Enzyme design. Structure first.
Site, mmCIF file in Angstrom:
data_model
loop_
_atom_site.group_PDB
_atom_site.id
_atom_site.type_symbol
_atom_site.label_atom_id
_atom_site.label_comp_id
_atom_site.label_asym_id
_atom_site.label_seq_id
_atom_site.Cartn_x
_atom_site.Cartn_y
_atom_site.Cartn_z
ATOM 1 C CB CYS A 87 -1.087 1.405 -11.677
ATOM 2 S SG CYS A 87 -0.471 2.744 -12.071
ATOM 3 C CG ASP A 110 -2.491 -0.903 1.174
ATOM 4 O OD1 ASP A 110 -2.711 -0.844 0.021
ATOM 5 O OD2 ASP A 110 -3.362 -0.378 1.723
ATOM 6 C CD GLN A 138 1.949 7.802 -9.784
ATOM 7 O OE1 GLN A 138 2.222 6.852 -9.365
ATOM 8 N NE2 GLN A 138 1.049 8.828 -9.269
ATOM 9 N NE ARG A 171 1.182 0.566 -7.056
ATOM 10 C CZ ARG A 171 0.205 -0.243 -5.972
ATOM 11 N NH1 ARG A 171 -0.564 -1.439 -6.177
ATOM 12 N NH2 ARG A 171 0.167 0.624 -4.545
ATOM 13 C CB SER A 172 1.320 1.800 -15.686
ATOM 14 O OG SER A 172 -0.132 1.666 -14.766
#
Ligand SMILES: Cn1nccc1C(=O)NCc1cccs1
Length: 284
Positions: free
Chosen positions: A215, A181, A262, A221-222
């Site tokens: 994502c 998370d 990010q 994440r992508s």
């Protein structure tokens, strides 16, 4: 510089935030006018994450052709990817319309439906064989065929039917279920194992349309997934694998979608994944 020793040099000097901010400063800025039209407000999950006009995927529809999705076309590596946000309640039909029209074989999902106690994307595929889904706005039917649950990811076989023509296709759903998370994984081993399973399925290969990867926003994440894949492919193709410059590859990908990777922690994790992945390829 090479990668593994540039890596230790940034760790010892603690300058990941400065490296990452340089990338942000040099990244391309292109217009995203279609994304910001008022009629598309409920088609965007986040107001600050939009596809560029020049690379956006168009739906084959005359009313409204808009989806928050971008084509990342990597010329030297000879790989293409579609990066998109997690579908919204009012865009699940558009999502499967795109999969159909772009002739994709696989969908890669890097988030859970609920994370941090909030919904990160719609439940956009069926959970039981006998309870199929019909998307009436785009005239598609989707059925769960089989499901294989492993410790770090789940693979599903799905049938997508175009109800207008009665044509059917098999779609593979690759779901990475264990990204934490907060932060990034401690080791890249399970993420690399997952990437190799997607590769082995044929979903990334030129005989199919581009893989669809998402994502929640479709940039973090992508971005890590496609950056690691492309860098490893280039290390296999070039005479000198140490010439592959992960920062340059990332800036190339950011010509096609804003914001890829990010955080500085995602940047460091991408280096780690490529470094470890290059040892397993050989030859080892
Ligand atoms: C209807 N609307 N007006 C402004 C913005 C929106 C919108 O649909 N935003 C996206 C999300 C909807 C629900 C969860 S996220």
């Amino acid at each position: 510089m090479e990668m593994e020793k540039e890596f230790e040099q940034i760790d010892k000097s603690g300058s990941w935030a400065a490296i990452y901010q340089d990338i942000r400063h040099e990244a391309s800025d292109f217009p995203s006018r279609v994304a910001k039209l008022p009629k598309n407000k409920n088609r965007n999950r986040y107001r600050d994450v939009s596809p560029f006009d020049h690379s956006r995927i168009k739906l084959h529809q005359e009313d409204n052709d808009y989806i928050n999705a971008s084509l990342i076309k990597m010329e030297e590596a000879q790989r293409s990817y579609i990066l998109t946000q997690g579908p919204l309640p009012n865009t699940v039909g558009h999502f499967w319309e795109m999969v159909w029209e772009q002739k994709s074989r696989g969908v890669v999902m890097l988030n859970r439906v609920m994370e941090k106690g909030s919904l990160k994307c719609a439940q956009y595929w069926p959970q039981k064989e006998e309870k199929e889904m019909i998307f009436e706005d785009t005239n598609l039917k989707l059925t769960l065929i089989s499901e294989d649950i492993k410790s770090y990811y789940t693979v599903r076989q799905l049938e997508l039917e175009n109800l207008t023509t009665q044509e059917t296709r098999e779609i593979l759903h690759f779901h990475y279920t264990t990204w934490p998370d907060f932060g990034v994984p401690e080791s890249p081993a399970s993420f690399l194992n997952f990437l190799f399973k997607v590769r082995e399925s044929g979903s990334l290969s030129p005989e199919h349309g581009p893989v669809v990867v998402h994502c929640s926003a479709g940039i973090g994440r992508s971005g890590t997934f496609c950056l690691a894949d492309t860098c490893l492919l280039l290390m296999d193709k070039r005479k000198d694998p140490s010439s592959v410059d992960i920062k340059k590859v990332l800036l190339e990908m950011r010509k096609f979608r804003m914001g890829l990777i990010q955080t500085a922690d995602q940047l460091r994790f991408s280096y780690l994944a490529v470094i470890e992945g290059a040892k397993f390829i050989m030859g080892d």
